[PDB]
Amino acid sequence: HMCDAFVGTWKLVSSENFDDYMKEVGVGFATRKVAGMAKPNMIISVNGDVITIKSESTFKNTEISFILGQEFDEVTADDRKVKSTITLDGGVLVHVQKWDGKSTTIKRKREDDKLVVECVMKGVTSTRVYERA
Ligand SMILES: CO[C@@H](C(=O)O)c1cccc(OCc2ccccc2Cl)c1OCc1ccccc1Cl
């Protein structure tokens, strides 16, 4: 029941500073422009200890499955090959991605009827807000 309030189908409804986040991560111009248009649907499910997060959009479809605290390989939507670990901290899903001596942290939390995603790379934060689909 660890992630019950996250489970479901969610649709992106707002974004702030995502272009700048992507710049900080090292994403190139064309990918930033196209990816920045996307309004993904995020599908979160749990089966035993395994959490699956799918993202479906016009730009790319991604899927990760993981156990909390157990590192895994991830290919991001911008084609980074990262090592990821996702944990729960006080009801917030905390996702750290490491690649090329770089790191980014993505936090997902339930706030009212929304799922709020905060993405941080160095001093740059982006906020992505999802509603139930
Ligand atoms: C599933 O993770 C979602 C979420 O929780 O909002 C999420 C959290 C943090 C960064 C994300 O994309 C980083 C990216 C995406 C595209 C280009 C450059 C970068 Cl740097 C992201 O996926 C967003 C995406 C996922 C799949 C398909 C399209 C999109 Cl636009």
Curated annotation (Swiss-Prot):
Q: Motif Nuclear localization signal, which positions?
A: 23-33
| Location relative to the cell | Cytoplasm; Nucleus
- Residues annotated as coiled-coil are none
Q: Which residues bind a fatty acid?
A: 128-130
What GO cellular-component annotations does this UniProt entry give? cytoplasm; cytosol; extracellular exosome; lipid droplet; nucleus
The principal location of this protein is cytoplasm
Single GO molecular-function term?
long-chain fatty acid binding
- Phosphoserine modification, residue list: 14
Q: Which residues carry this modification: Phosphotyrosine?
A: 21
Sites where N-acetylcysteine occurs are at 3
One Gene Ontology term from the biological process aspect of the record: white fat cell differentiation
The record ties this protein, via CDD domains, to: FABP4 (cd19467)
Q: Give the function comment from the record.
A: Lipid transport protein in adipocytes. Binds both long chain fatty acids and retinoic acid. Delivers long-chain fatty acids and retinoic acid to their cognate receptors in the nucleus.
What does its UniProt record remark on the domains? Forms a beta-barrel structure that accommodates hydrophobic ligands in its interior.
Report quaternary structure and partners: Monomer. Homodimer. Interacts with PPARG.
Protein name as annotated: Fatty acid-binding protein, adipocyte
Q: Which organism is it from?
A: Homo sapiens (Human)
Gene responsible for this protein: FABP4
